[PDB]
Amino acid sequence: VEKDLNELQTLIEAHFENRKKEEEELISLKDRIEKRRAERAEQQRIRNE
Amino acid sequence: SDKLKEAETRAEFAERSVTKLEKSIDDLEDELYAQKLKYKAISEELDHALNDMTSI
Prior knowledge:
The structure is cut from a larger assembly and holds chains A and B.
Chain A: H1 2-48
Chain B: H1 2-54
Function (chain A): Troponin T is the tropomyosin-binding subunit of troponin, the thin filament regulatory complex which confers calcium-sensitivity to striated muscle actomyosin ATPase activity.
Protein name (chain A): Troponin T, cardiac muscle
Family (chain A): Belongs to the troponin T family.
């Protein structure tokens, strides 16, 4: 049960790290998304002007 | 003249549709951001729990 706990906490921290990388990627996605929102807003506003 | 009126009406319809679509996509992005915020909050709480469990 000790080595079970060890491997389990190992995989726990592992998927922690994996989902963490995925969250970092998703955050960067949101950031470039807001960049896209801003660029669409400015170009739309230019068109409307 | 008939063709010009048809084209103008099409343009107005498409412009209004694009306005609605833009507003809707922005609102849905806001909702996704909020749910991601909730997920991150509970994830940080669980990470604190894991930090304490390291002492467990």
